[PDB]
Structures are given as structure tokens and as C-alpha cells.
Design a protein around this ligand. Structure first.
Ligand SMILES: *[C@@H]1O[C@H](CO)[C@@H](O[C@@H]2O[C@H](CO)[C@@H](O[C@@H]3O[C@H](CO[C@H]4O[C@H](CO)[C@@H](O)[C@H](O)[C@@H]4O)[C@@H](O)[C@H](O[C@H]4O[C@H](CO)[C@@H](O)[C@H](O)[C@@H]4O[C@H]4O[C@H](CO)[C@@H](O)[C@H](O)[C@@H]4O)[C@@H]3O)[C@H](O)[C@H]2NC(C)=O)[C@H](O)[C@H]1NC(C)=O
Ligand SMILES: *[C@@H]1O[C@H](CO)[C@@H](O[C@@H]2O[C@H](CO)[C@@H](O)[C@H](O)[C@H]2NC(C)=O)[C@H](O)[C@H]1NC(C)=O
Lengths: 132, 51, 107
């Protein structure tokens, strides 16, 4: 069954850099979009990034636009999220989510566009925080 | 071999990603990438007509 | 930009008690609205994907309704395994905003 795992998150100096990784198994990783979301204490969930199946098209929320960078490697069935200039407001539990339906079907530019997705499978998030 | 590939549609401005099984004899690897990046046999000589 | 509001913020119930959760969208989203539940310390789980389509594996007890701007969730016979935060999320938009999150506990 679809299993997801993420690692690499942890303590980091404020304003520095960090790298988050996520591995998956039990499905064709080269046919599902991947999204990264956070869960801060108190305040509700918040989606921060998304990447297509082939790893070409990328999109991020305005709160992390330009600062973060999402990438993937279909050969190793891994996903990554580079962090640069992270701040104290980014401390949260990052979850490695996968969309509900594969990218097959009609499309305009990228294979998975022109379709609405939702986070069906979520990996056990990893804590991320920064302090002195 | 379970192959997936892009394809055109009735709408010239739209494209679609499909998949279908292909016998290994009717597939030839491009050799630029291994484990994927396959090509239909005789594609570099003529476009076959579907019966 | 599009934003979502979820109410009631919190409520108490008991085994077999009937309660409901609802949320609204600042702009029309037709029916692209999903519901999730998250136990404390675990990752969230999908419960309802479309505005009224239940997720496979979840008990048939669960149901939802709504369209356009307002949506509602009905737990029916609350059993001990339904006590966890319920998040209202809307898709078919650039941010994919989530709800404020509502936690149902025992009275
Ligand atoms: C249907 O049509 C769509 C749309 O055209 C098409 O999507 C595109 O597919 C191609 C082929 O898979 C994608 O090209 C790959 O993209 C990624 C990422 O590239 C981005 O990121 C890098 C930085 O990381 C930027 O430099 C770059 O400009 C892009 O922004 C790469 O992984 C791929 O390159 C690797 O593979 C090549 C082929 O083997 C190698 O020559 C190359 O050196 C790279 O390999 C290295 O990196 C790998 C990943 O780390 C690693 O595994 C290797 O060992 C090695 O180290 C390649 O450029 C393209 O991005 C897709 N998207 C778009 C919008 O064009 C679908 O593929 C197509 N679908 C079907 C079924 O036909
Ligand atoms: C078209 O592609 C085929 C398949 O790659 C080519 O046929 C091969 O050519 C190489 C040349 O070194 C031979 O070693 C192989 O034995 C040939 N057969 C196969 C099955 O690989 C062919 O030459 C290409 N060109 C034309 C005009 O057909």
C-alpha cells in the first residue's frame, strides 16, 4: 500500500539553509503530483509548494515564493524541498503529501494540469524549527 | 512493456498523456537513457498505417 | 485572495450524540471541497473528497452536503473513534486554503 516517509528536517540557524527529503513506495511515483504542506501550532494547516509528476512545473505559496525550491527524482522515487533564508515563522511540521489521482488525461501545458487534486495520502511529518 | 506517452487530441491546443502495453519486439530503446525513453520500431524509416 | 471560515470553532459531544460542522468560502468554488480528520500527533486523513462523495474505507455513517459557497459535515452516530480535529479544505485554487480546524471532544 502507498507508504510515504520524510527525513532531513530539524534544527537550523535562523536565516540559514535546510534541505527536506521524502521517499515513497507502493505506487508509480512517476505518475502522481507531490505537494508540501505545514502544520504550525495553533494556526491551521497551510500548503506551501507543489510539483508535477515529471518535476518540470513548480508552484509555491506567496509566503515561501522564491525562498523555497521543490524538486524530485523519479529514478530513485524521492522528493525534496530546499530551504534558503528560512525564518522563525517557518517552524512547523512539514508533511509529504501525494495527490489522489494520477496525471493521466487531457492537459494544456504540463501533464497534470487542468485537473483538481486533493491530499489523499500524507506521510508522517517531520518537525522543523529554528532558534539560537 | 507498459509504456506511457504524450499524445495529441481533437483540440489542437490540447494534449493528453496515455498508456498502453506494447510487445517488446515493437519497441526499440533510444539508448540516450536506459530503463525508459523507448521508441517504436521502424519509426526512423516510415510511419505505419493502422489497419 | 480566497479564504475560508469554519464554525463552530469547538464543541463537545458524546457517544451517539449528533453534531455537525460547517464552513464557508469567500468566493464560489462549485463543489471542490474536501474534509479531513487528524488524531493528536498523527497525520491528517482524507474523509470526504468531493462536496458529497465519501472516501473509500471510511464508515458509511459519514456524509456531507453543500455547494457553491456553503458546505456542511454530519457525523451522525458519533462513536469513540470520531473524536479528532476536522479540517475544511477547498481546492481548485492557487493556495488550496485550509479551514481553521474544529476539534470535537467528549462532554
Ligand atoms: C509529456 O510532456 C511533458 C511536457 O513536455 C514532459 O515533461 C517533461 O519531461 C522531461 C523528461 O522527463 C523533463 O525533463 C527532466 O526534468 C528534470 C528537472 O529539470 C528541472 O530542474 C533542473 C534542476 O534540477 C533544471 O536545470 C531544469 O531546467 C528544470 O527546471 C530533470 O530530472 C531531468 O534531467 C535529468 O535527466 C536527464 C535524462 O536522463 C539527464 O540528462 C540529466 O542530466 C538529468 O539527470 C540527472 O538528474 C537526475 C535527477 O536528479 C538524476 O536522476 C540523474 O542521475 C542525473 O543526476 C530532465 O531535464 C521535463 O522537466 C518535464 N517537464 C517539462 C515542463 O518539460 C513529459 O515527460 C512527457 N511525458 C511523457 C510520458 O512522454
Ligand atoms: C533505424 O533504427 C534501427 C534500430 O535501431 C537501426 O537498425 C540497427 O542499426 C544498427 C546500426 O549499428 C545495427 O547494429 C542493428 O543491428 C540494427 N538493428 C537493430 C534491431 O537494432 C537502423 O539502422 C536505423 N536506420 C534505418 C534507416 O533503419
Amino acid at each position: 500500500e502507498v507508504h510515504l516517509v520524510e527525513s532531513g528536517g530539524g534544527l537550523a540557524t535562523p536565516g540559514g539553509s535546510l534541505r527536506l527529503s521524502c521517499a515513497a513506495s507502493g505506487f508509480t511515483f512517476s505518475n502522481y503530483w507531490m505537494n508540501w504542506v505545514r502544520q504550525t501550532p495553533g494556526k491551521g494547516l497551510e500548503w506551501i509548494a507543489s510539483i508535477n509528476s515529471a518535476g518540470g512545473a513548480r508552484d509555491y505559496a506567496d509566503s515561501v515564493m522564491g525562498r523555497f525550491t521543490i524538486s524530485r527524482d523519479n529514478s530513485k522515487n524521492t522528493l525534496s524541498l530546499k530551504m534558503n533564508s528560512l525564518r522563525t515563522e517557518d517552524t512547523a511540521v512539514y508533511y509529504c503529501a501525494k495527490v489522489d489521482e494520477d496525471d493521466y488525461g487531457y492537459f494544456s501545458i504540463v501533464p497534470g494540469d487542468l485537473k483538481k487534486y486533493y491530499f489523499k495520502y500524507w506521510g508522517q511529518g517531520v518537525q522543523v524549527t529554528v532558534s539560537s | 512493456k507498459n509504456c506511457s506517452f504524450n499524445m495529441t487530441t481533437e483540440l489542437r491546443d490540447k494534449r493528453q498523456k496515455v498508456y498502453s502495453l506494447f510487445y517488446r519486439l515493437d519497441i526499440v530503446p533510444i539508448n540516450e537513457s536506459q530503463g525508459s525513453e523507448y521508441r517504436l520500431i521502424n519509426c526512423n524509416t516510415s510511419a505505419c498505417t493502422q489497419a | 485572495d480566497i479564504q475560508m471560515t469554519q464554525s463552530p470553532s469547538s464543541l463537545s459531544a458524546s457517544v451517539g450524540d449528533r453534531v455537525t460542522i460547517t464552513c464557508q468560502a469567500s468566493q464560489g468554488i462549485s463543489s471542490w471541497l474536501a474534509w479531513y480528520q487528524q488524531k493528536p500527533g498523527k497525520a491528517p486523513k482524507s474523509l470526504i473528497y468531493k462536496a458529497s462523495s465519501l472516501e473509500s474505507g471510511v464508515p458509511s455513517r459519514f456524509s456531507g452536503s453543500g455547494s457553491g459557497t456553503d458546505f456542511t459535515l454530519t457525523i451522525s452516530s458519533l462513536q469513540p473513534e470520531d473524536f479528532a480535529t476536522y479540517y475544511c479544505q477547498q481546492y481548485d485554487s492557487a493556495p488550496f486554503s485550509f479551514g481553521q480546524g474544529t476539534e470535537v471532544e467528549i462532554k
